[PDB]
A paper describes a structure:
PaAP is associated with biofilm development and contributes to nutrient recycling.
The PA domain was also captured in an alternative conformation in the truncated construct, PaAP_TE340A(trunc). Interestingly, the modified C-terminus (thrombin cleavage site, LVPR) is fully traceable in the PaAP_T structure and binds to the PA domain of an adjacent protomer, where the C-terminus interacts directly with R189A. The interaction of the C-terminus with an adjacent PA domain aids crystal packing, the protomers are linked together, akin to a chain. A similar observation was also seen in PaAP_TE340A(trunc), which instead packed head to tail. Interestingly, the thrombin-cleaved C-terminus of PaAP_TE340A (confirmed by intact MS) remained as a bound ligand in the crystal structure, suggesting that the liberated C-terminus propeptide is degraded by active PaAP.
Numbering used by the authors: 46 to 516
Write the structure that this text describes.
């Protein structure tokens, strides 16, 4: 298993990829979570420690490593917010019924007189409340600005309040029609720079408050917000044809709620062990590995990588394999539906070939499997938009296992594939080691097979004729 002959072959690499080594790496990832507040979310020290770990492992194995940074504004709500009247009479208002956060607000604990700003009430109003600087013409600094929705963005309103000396901002719904009087999920924008907290209230509350002389509100907004950057970790073999790159990826960040050991520690740790084993391989085609950042924020890291590649470099990538959640405790054996056989949506030419390879491996291991939707749910998405052939594995998340699936893969019908999905309890004990083992083996077989010959993809591309041959 030391020798390069074993790890270079599609049946040898799975035998050399031990589930127990992946679990050791998973335990390392969970230790990183425990040592940095129980999560590995983007722009947290948990993710910084994950990057350091991935990078030093890849270097120790002999890779030149790129830690690719890209700008990222982190906003994680930490707990429920509070709103209380202190003057004239004490009144505690109900969270998610009277008021909610503006997404991308700053944190704060502010008790101040409330001053309404350019209010235009009534059914059918066309309010310009706080949209202009003159609306704050006599606004006493230190106050909480009571502002009505209308015309302009919430960001513009709150930043005007901040430039006026406001301690905090309460935006209530416009109320120009009957169903515009309640709470909504709204945003001050990723570009908000007001520095002060902003919450959202119902219309009837906003009216009452504007009509209360001497009103003072105590306002507690309990979030993390940080304009910063985060990282992708990219490394490729020094061996291999650089014009025919086989690329694998797994996103390395977690949600803020938990350690994210299955989502997506499983893909990351499996891919890392495979990369260490391939350090000593003899591929025909160059293998590139990426651990993506800020994926739980909307595929930001992988999208950044792909969009910021020179065209000359992007045409060199032949296939992308995505491994996101492959240790689900109530697992099924799901393969991306590259040919559209199940859901009618096809990948770029070559994706059906990749799918057939994954199908072949599960068949060889005496295992059933089936398709899963590929409508841009994970980090292959910008690869899809670029016309690059792709595929990947999935063991299931918040969907419920069917009876047919229960008799195919074991586990419990009627229960989620991963009941700890995006939760605090997504830790080391949430991994099904049979699922992890078999999907790591499948990852290995297909990666290695493509590392020896992309012909099945080349053939599909040639039959498509939509991207002629350049060499
Ligand atoms: Mg105005
Ligand atoms: Zn995921
Ligand atoms: Zn996720
Ligand atoms: Zn299919």
């Amino acid at each position: 298993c030391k020798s390069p002959l074993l790890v270079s072959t599609p049946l040898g690499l799975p035998r050399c990829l031990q589930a127990s080594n992946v679990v050791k790496r998973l335990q390392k990832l969970e230790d990183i979570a425990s040592l940095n507040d129980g999560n590995r979310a983007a722009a947290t020290p948990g993710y910084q420690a994950s990057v350091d770990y991935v990078k030093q492992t890849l270097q120790k194995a002999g890779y030149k490593v790129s830690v690719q940074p890209f700008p990222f504004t982190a906003y994680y709500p930490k707990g429920p917010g509070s709103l209380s009247a202190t003057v004239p009479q004490p009144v505690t208002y109900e969270w998610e019924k009277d008021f909610t956060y503006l997404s991308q607000t700053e944190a704060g604990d502010v008790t101040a007189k409330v001053v309404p700003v350019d209010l235009s009430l009534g059914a059918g109003n066309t309010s310009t409340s706080g949209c202009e600087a003159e609306d704050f013409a006599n606004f006493p600094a230190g106050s909480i600005a009571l502002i009505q929705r209308g015309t302009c963005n919430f960001e513009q309103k709150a930043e005007n309040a901040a430039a006026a000396g406001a301690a905090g901002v309460i935006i209530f719904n416009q109320g120009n029609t009957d169903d515009r009087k309640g709470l909504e999920n709204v945003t001050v924008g990723e570009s908000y720079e007001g520095g002060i907290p902003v919450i959202f209230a119902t219309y009837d509350n906003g009216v009452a408050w504007s009509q209360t002389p001497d009103l003072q509100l105590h306002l507690v907004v309990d979030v993390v917000r940080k304009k910063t950057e985060t990282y992708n970790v990219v490394a490729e073999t020094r061996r291999g044809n650089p014009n025919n790159v086989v690329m694998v990826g797994a996103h390395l960040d977690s949600v803020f709620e938990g350690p994210g050991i299955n989502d997506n520690g499983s893909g990351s740790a499996a891919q890392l062990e495979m990369a260490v084993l391939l350090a000593k391989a003899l591929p025909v085609n160059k293998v590139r590995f990426a651990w993506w950042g800020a994926a739980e924020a909307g595929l930001v890291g992988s999208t950044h990588y792909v969009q910021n590649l020179a065209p000359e470099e992007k045409k060199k990538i032949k296939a992308y394999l995505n491994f996101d959640m492959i240790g689900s405790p109530n697992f099924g054996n799901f393969i991306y539906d590259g040919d559209g056989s199940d859901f009618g949506l096809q990948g770029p030419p070559g994706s059906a070939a990749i799918e057939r390879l994954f199908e072949a491996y599960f068949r060889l291991r005496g295992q059933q499997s089936e398709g899963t939707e590929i409508d841009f749910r994970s980090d292959y998405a910008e690869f899809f938009n670029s016309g690059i052939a792709f595929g990947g594995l999935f063991t299931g998340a918040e969907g419920l296992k069917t009876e047919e699936q229960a008799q195919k893969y074991g586990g419990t019908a009627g229960k989620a594939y991963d009941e700890c999905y995006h939760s605090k309890c997504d830790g080391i004990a949430n991994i099904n080691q049979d699922a992890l083992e078999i999907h790591s083996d499948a990852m290995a077989f297909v990666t290695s097979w493509l590392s020896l010959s992309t012909k099945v993809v080349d053939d599909e591309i040639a039959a498509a004729g939509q991207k002629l041959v350049p060499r």
